Amino acid sequence: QPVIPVRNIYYMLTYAWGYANLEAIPGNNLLDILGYVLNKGVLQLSRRGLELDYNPNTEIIPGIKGRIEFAKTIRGFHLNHGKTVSTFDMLNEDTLANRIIKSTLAILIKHEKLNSTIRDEARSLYRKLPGISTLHLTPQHFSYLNGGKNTRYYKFVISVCKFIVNNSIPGQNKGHYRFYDFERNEKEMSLLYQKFLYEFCRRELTSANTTRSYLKWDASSISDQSLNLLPRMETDITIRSSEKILIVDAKYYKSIFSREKFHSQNLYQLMNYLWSLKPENGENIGGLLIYPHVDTAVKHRYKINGFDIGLCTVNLGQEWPCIHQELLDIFDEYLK
Amino acid sequence: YCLEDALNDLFIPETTIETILKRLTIKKNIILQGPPGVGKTFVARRLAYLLTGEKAPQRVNMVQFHQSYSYEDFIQGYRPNGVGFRRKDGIFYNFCQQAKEQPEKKYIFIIDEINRANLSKVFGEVMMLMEHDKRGENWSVPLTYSENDEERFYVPENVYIIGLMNTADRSLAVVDYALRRRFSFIDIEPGFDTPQFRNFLLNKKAEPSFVESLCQKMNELNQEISKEATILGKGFRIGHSYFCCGLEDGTSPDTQWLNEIVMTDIAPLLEEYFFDDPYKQQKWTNKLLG
Amino acid sequence: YCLEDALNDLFIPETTIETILKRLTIKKNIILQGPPGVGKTFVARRLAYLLTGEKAPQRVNMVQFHQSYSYEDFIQGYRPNGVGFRRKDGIFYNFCQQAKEQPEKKYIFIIDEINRANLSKVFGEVMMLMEHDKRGENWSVPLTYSENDEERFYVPENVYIIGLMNTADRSLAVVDYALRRRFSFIDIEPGFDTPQFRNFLLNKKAEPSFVESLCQKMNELNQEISKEATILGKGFRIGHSYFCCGLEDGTSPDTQWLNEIVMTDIAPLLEEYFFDDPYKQQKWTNKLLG
Amino acid sequence: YCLEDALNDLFIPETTIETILKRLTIKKNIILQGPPGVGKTFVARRLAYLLTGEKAPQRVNMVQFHQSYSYEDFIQGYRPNGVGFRRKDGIFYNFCQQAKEQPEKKYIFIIDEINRANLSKVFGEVMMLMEHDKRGENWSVPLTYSENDEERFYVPENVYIIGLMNTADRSLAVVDYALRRRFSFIDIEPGFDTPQFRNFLLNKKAEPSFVESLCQKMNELNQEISKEATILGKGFRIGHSYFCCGLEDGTSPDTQWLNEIVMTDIAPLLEEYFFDDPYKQQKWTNKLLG
Amino acid sequence: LNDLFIPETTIETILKRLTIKKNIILQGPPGVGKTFVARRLAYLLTGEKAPQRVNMVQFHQSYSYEDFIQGYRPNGVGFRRKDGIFYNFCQQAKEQPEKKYIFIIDEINRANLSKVFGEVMMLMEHDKRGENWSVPLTYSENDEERFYVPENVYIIGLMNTADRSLAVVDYALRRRFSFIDIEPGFDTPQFRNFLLNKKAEPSFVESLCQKMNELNQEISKEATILGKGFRIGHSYFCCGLEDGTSPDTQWLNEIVMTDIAPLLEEYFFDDPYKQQKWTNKLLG
Amino acid sequence: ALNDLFIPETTIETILKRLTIKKNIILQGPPGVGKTFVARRLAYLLTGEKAPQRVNMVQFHQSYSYEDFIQGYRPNGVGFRRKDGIFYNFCQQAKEQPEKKYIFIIDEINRANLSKVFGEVMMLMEHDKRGENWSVPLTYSENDEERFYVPENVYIIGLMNTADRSLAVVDYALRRRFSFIDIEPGFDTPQFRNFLLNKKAEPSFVESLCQKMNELNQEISKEATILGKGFRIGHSYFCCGLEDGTSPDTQWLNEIVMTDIAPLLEEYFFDDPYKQQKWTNKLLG
Ligand SMILES: Nc1nc2c(ncn2[C@@H]2O[C@H](COP(=O)(O)OP(=O)(O)NP(=O)(O)O)[C@@H](O)[C@H]2O)c(=O)[nH]1
Ligand SMILES: Nc1nc2c(ncn2[C@@H]2O[C@H](COP(=O)(O)OP(=O)(O)NP(=O)(O)O)[C@@H](O)[C@H]2O)c(=O)[nH]1
Ligand SMILES: Nc1nc2c(ncn2[C@@H]2O[C@H](COP(=O)(O)OP(=O)(O)NP(=O)(O)O)[C@@H](O)[C@H]2O)c(=O)[nH]1
Ligand SMILES: Nc1nc2c(ncn2[C@@H]2O[C@H](COP(=O)(O)OP(=O)(O)O)[C@@H](O)[C@H]2O)c(=O)[nH]1
Ligand SMILES: Nc1nc2c(ncn2[C@@H]2O[C@H](COP(=O)(O)OP(=O)(O)O)[C@@H](O)[C@H]2O)c(=O)[nH]1
Ligand SMILES: [Mg+2]
Ligand SMILES: [Mg+2]
Ligand SMILES: [Mg+2]
Fold first, then answer.
1. Which residues bind GTP (chain E)?
2. Looking at ligand 5, which atom is closest to the CA of residue F234?
3. Residue D255 sits in the same domain as residue D186
4. Residues F74 and F194 in one domain
């Protein structure tokens, strides 16, 4: 039951969210890593300054501040006890984005399995934000912020905060928390991997164009033009260049970590993607199977039904730059 | 006032409108909860004339709620004169007073966009009287602004209250506590896959095949909306009134007319809905065009 | 007044302009969403003269929403008189009375920067009434501060409303989807591609290569803007207003003039746009200069 | 007033000043952005007398914005005269009436620390009007608190606006991109490596070797600040003012004087800019002294 | 200059900076006599022990520009514009230019300083003092009527270093203010001489400095979480011994549980053992 | 009075040593500790005359504001008048009598924003700054003819409770000006046992009950985060109902277990009924 070294996982998450030295931290487990980013990440913001969004406030005060609302004043007779119903703009850091940070930190402190120094620093910051109000967090809170007015930097830590909240489980005690065993589940790990590549390829493969391509079946049915019954088919990624087009389907399987029979069931999807897809340019059509392995990388080529297909692997756990080196080498060969 | 005049044009099933009539006679405090463009405001005017059986304006009164609406205007309150402060009977107070004269005849009050204002601020004390069981002079109360305890106000049993609420905003996830107890929610469906919606188009010189292809897409589209729960629930789904409008001249339905509606209404809405995924906009927006 | 006079200087295609009137005349309330500098304010004053067919200001009204507009201000509110308060009819109520003075001649109300104000709070009762179908005496409604003697306000049929929401500020966007159905949203592009834009420069002593050079770079840059959606969406792409102005004195358009624009206004805007790596600034700044 | 009278003690190059006056005559609205301590406030009052050409303060108005400033204070709003409230012509409103009386003479409004106050809320109606091509009666607008549509406010052409916005705080920035367009943004540099700054020092009986050593020190440090744009942009870099004032007594600028100021002002400043690195604090501090 | 426990050099540094710069910030932990320093110092600069000239206030988060400078507030009849203290105070010194009038602001960090000061955040600068730099205030009815700091005014700011708020950092205000740190001063003989001039044991006073410094160094040990700004002040020892009770180890035992222990709790949060250790170490 | 109080005499002596010097104090403890009854007896103790008139008590809440506490404008029959609050009225009464100590009780202080209520005055209540020297004109004091100063005689007591886990860290404002004291429930103390043996309680019934409560109060404080030392149960429930005229008995205790402790225990844990049922039954036997 072998798994990836935890430090390497953080890099793929970064590309997934689209935005460093982790040698310093000694806690191998993820939450130690993840908290150190957040705990330090907030500190980066505070140096420049946290977001202050003007919240208009309509309240009853003993005097004129901003704009008086004449109606509520007369109806409540607040003139008599020397008060007005007035609208004015207090400037707070109490916005939803910043509130999430402090509320997120509470769970971070409450986590049972955590480095003490990390918990020490976090508890300091928790105190350092008195004005902001604690909250009981839900995904809908993160949902409201998908508008993304905030800076590019804020969206990073919030993406971190989203990962923590969804991957937080109460542990030994009712109050305390315990981290999810993220690596063990394949689906989210695979869904990470599928998303990891799509954003990664845009960065490095500037030469090529990277798109996820929706496809329509070549079928026609006398029954229905809709073909709703047919499976929805959307490529994981397509990486088109003028000389050659190329589709990749990548998934995380547990069997493959064992070096025997091979689990390539996803391949069955691939041919039908090649088939229904028709290029006007007619430059070429290629496919790739790429999986994560631990020890070593092996690359093969295939010529099956008029299609050029590759099976390849990467030895995650080696080193991130050499891993980064390997991927650029990989796509270059097949793309050519 | 025949039902046939009222109900023929309507897209909603005869099942739901009749069920609506049941709870309305039973409880008299109703909320119609659905997204915009399904005729929530459209039906509500018809139901009043249905139940009364006549087209009479006096017995029916309509309002739209907003943040500024308050007790002092709704029920009773003081309006300044040149210097002095004069009390004024509000609408709902005056409305029941008319209804008191004719207890036999049904009287209706229509409240659009009720969630926008908190009911407690406006109704307040009257939420005691408003409930279906605690109506009539037996439960009479003197008002906050009554000069003396002697004068009292009771909601006569004759009045029925209708509330139109739209499930399009994130704030409404925390539905107000006041409404749930005193009002009975009813859902209004979008109603694409209905004969009468189809029959409306067919009468207006529409190809039958063109209609059914459209409905499958919208029903397919709304299915995608409803599947999400975090950002867009089932209540966010599209109504059936974008397509109703614009055919009054007689211009025949076609993909050409559809494209104007799509580009000018539904695509930027989808940009608003599907901000994070431009491709999902491209996926659906182009899907309709085909 | 006629289209040729209006569209003489406008850089917008004819396509949208008729499409605008297609949506407007049926729907009567519209919104134009585009980045700043595409003539949103510019066309809107001109469009009013088309529908009336005349260059008249009297039937037209223009205002801007500044995040302190209120229902007391727009429609009906209380203002202090010398010692004591009075009720004052707001601007729209004052406007509508003139509009219904003669139904034949169309009346236009223009709201710049409409997105800012909390429109549900401001309009209140009007949010239902503005719609094309729900106009006239049939849908007459009593206002909040209306007199106890029943006096009702209905949106006249002749009235047309136009809204102008810039697409830069994401937060300041319509999330009241019930309200977004009343309006129809018309995307407006930057206006670079058009020859009518190009003709303006050549008429003002411009080289076609330098002209065609300019148009080539911006559209590529707007793609770089349009490529992202996380921070800089499609709407952020740059308008053409910067280049329009400053040439009346006789300064011919050249790299000297272009260089002044680039360093002075756009390049500061760019560093705020990206604010992650200057190289992205250094690249695109130099590209324009080359 | 005359140009050279101002330039004698001014550290900024004349080209920028010429660039400033070139835009300002055109755009009529500008924003000067730089770190604190570079004479934004210093130049601005001088610049007004240049642009008018006459040292008349009556035509000049200077204010500092802050959080507790609103449209009611700035432009117009209802405020208590006494027992009875009145509509109060705001400060900018009053200034504009003065400018109308003398259209020929330029009138200038100077806003320090502009970025603090919520500008969208403050300007509002002005946000459209202030543009150089939209000034005049043709674009006259009725205000929020205007009695009727006829009461309208238009900015005159003569008006010039000068805005001062520090670059130290990323929290408070003019992210409102629409507003960014109205103002023409002029960056300003600390200007250590200028003869005019050095000539002032040498005029104050200063060692030429010490001067050039000093200028080299900060110039390198400022570039170090500009390097790590992710954490700290060039906008954070140190100004020249710390060194400017304090020699009025006649004290010669010895190293001891410099050693004192660094301990009192710059030392903690470095600590905050570099919270994590103590070595970097000691490194740069010691580098200046040695 | 006699009973002060702080070095003569720093106050001499302060006096020159204050006279020249005209604004200063004294930043240090609570209990170092920031108030008494400024209060003593204000009397020095004036040259007379005059309290009417000197005014002291304690900001708090809700304190506002309405209170400080100008504001609309109710009289018996109705609402009026009420000149806040600083406007009233500057007007008072404006009557008498020659003498030096002083305004002391405690717990400055808590409030949103930009909001409170507002307009004067520019005017307060030493060079920009006079009618030439006058501006009309926010609530000023007419533009012509303005407010300007006079040259005599000097402002002193007392700042607690124990509540860092990662909400607003302003480096522009730091330009106006010349920052001066204050150490507790246990090592200083002048603090020690007070106790030896109160019939203290020579070892007991000397032993205390060893005890606190070991604690103080630990507080300043971890620069990231804490600093010298957090370390303990001395003033707790000043009070409570003028009754006539000379120092003794029993007296020390009272203060530690009474006063210092909550401070430790705050700093050494969720670490009872370290509190027990360092607390008991002082007892030894 | 000394014997009637159930806490150690040592703490009672300690407080007077604290309050007399510090002049500002706050008592933080579980509910049902007799915080109100404690302070009054302590207040009367300091003066020595047992005068309730000298003492004035206030209970804070979030709505409570400066207008109620100090000064504000209230409607007249026509128009409005300046209306003196409690504390402004209170101290001026004490100003006449400098020698006489006057006490002020602020219950549930932590709920409200101290700044909003006090306003200006929060610095003047710090012991060092008292008397004529530290005079300040008030916000609503239109004239400068008269200034308000809290005199030295004043002592201020604050009743705070550590009952609620919802409570976050105390406001910084409090910590500076207030000396925090934690009060034990006082079950172990002899004075509480002598109040039950005076009612003919069995020493076995007494010792078992002292043993019974101590184990729970230890257990509730065993929890690190959710339930601290502040949560643990107080003795006030045992007082009321014995000296009224009804003798102690297991059924009388059994009634009290159902009365308050059984619902109180549920709220604290709020997770496991068996954990409550175990302890609730354990109390019975
Ligand atoms: N002909 C016809 N029109 C319908 C039908 N249902 C709705 N409409 C039309 O849809 C338009 C708006 O209906 P409406 O009740 O206002 O929707 P709403 O729920 O009130 N909108 P909102 O939620 O935004 O307030 C009207 O033209 C209405 O007549 C229908 O069944 N038949
Ligand atoms: N001559 C001419 N000028 C145009 C054209 N389009 C835009 N402009 C000019 O660009 C400038 C600004 O136009 P404007 O309507 O205010 O754009 P806006 O979207 O309203 N601005 P904002 O979004 O900031 O409110 C004006 O000089 C305007 O005349 C055009 O087609 N022809
Ligand atoms: N003598 C002289 N002083 C200058 C010159 N330039 C700037 N200064 C000085 O630097 C100080 C501040 O000027 P100021 O405009 O307020 O700087 P600022 O950037 O606006 N500061 P802030 O942004 O914080 O308001 C004054 O002492 C000013 O005279 C100069 O060229 N000559
Ligand atoms: N003699 C003498 N007394 C001091 C010294 N520092 C503080 N005190 C006294 O300590 C008491 C409290 O000072 P305080 O201002 O409240 O502490 P701070 O505000 O936190 O700095 C007053 O009597 C001060 O005068 C000092 O250095 N020397
Ligand atoms: N006789 C006597 N009664 C006490 C003692 N301690 C508390 N009480 C009683 O307990 C009750 C007050 O408890 P308290 O905790 O203040 O109530 P709470 O404020 O609601 O929490 C009164 O009946 C007090 O007289 C005591 O030591 N002696
Ligand atoms: Mg409706
Ligand atoms: Mg515009
Ligand atoms: Mg300045």
1. 28-35, 127-130, 160-163
2. 15
3. no
4. no
The verdict on the CB of residue D241 being under 6 Å from ligand 3 is yes
Same domain, C173 and C215: no
User: Does some domain include residue D2?
Assistant: no
Which residues sit opposite B111 in a β-bridge?
Answer: B63, B163
Same domain, D93 and D146: yes
Residue B36 is part of which domain span?
7-190
Burial class (CB in 10 A: 0-12, 13-18, 19+), B208: exposed
Same domain, C57 and C73: yes
Domain membership flag for residue B63: yes
Question: Which is it for strands B107-112 and B60-64: parallel, antiparallel or unpaired?
Answer: parallel
User: What is the C-alpha to C-alpha distance for residues A38 and A160, in angstroms, rounded to an integer?
Assistant: 7
Computed over its alpha carbons, how large is the radius of gyration of chain E? 22
The method of structure determination was cryo-EM
- Shared domain for C60 and C144, answered yes or no, is yes
Specify whether the CB–CB gap between E108 and E59 falls below 8 A. Answer: yes
CA–CA dist C208, C202 (Å, integer): 7
Q: Round to whole Å and give the CA distance between B220 and D33.
A: 52
Q: Does any domain span residue B2?
A: no
Q: How long, in residues, is chain B?
A: 290
- One-letter amino acid at E101 equals Y
Q: Which ligand does the CA of E41 lie closest to?
A: 4
Residues of A in contact with E269 (CB under 8 A): 123-124, 127
Tell whether E6 and E77 lie within a shared domain.
yes
Interface of C with A (CB under 8 A): 67-68, 70, 72, 77-80, 85, 145, 169-171, 173, 230-231, 275-276
Strands (E) across chain D are located at 29-34, 60-64, 76-80, 85-89, 108-112, 141-142, 152-153, 160-166, 184-187
Q: Whose CA is nearest to atom 22 of ligand 2?
A: C36
CB of A56 less than 8 A from some CB of B: no
* E167, E191: one domain: no
Closest-CA residue to D17 (of D37, D36, D192, D39): D39
Rounded CA gap, E17 and E36, in Å?
Answer: 19
User: How many domains is chain E partitioned into structurally?
Assistant: 2
Tokens 């507002």 -> residue: E118
- Paired sense of beta strands D184-187 and D29-34, if any: parallel
Of F185, F207, F229, which one is at a domain's C-terminal end? F185
CA distance B175 to B167: 10
Distance D135 CA to ligand 2 centre (A): 13
Domain endpoint, select from C169, C190, C211 = C190
Contact B220 A146 (CB under 8 A): no
Tally of CB atoms within 10 A around D275: 14
Facing D177 at nearest CB: one of C62, C168, C260: C168
Residues in chain F within 8 Å Cβ distance of E56: 123, 134
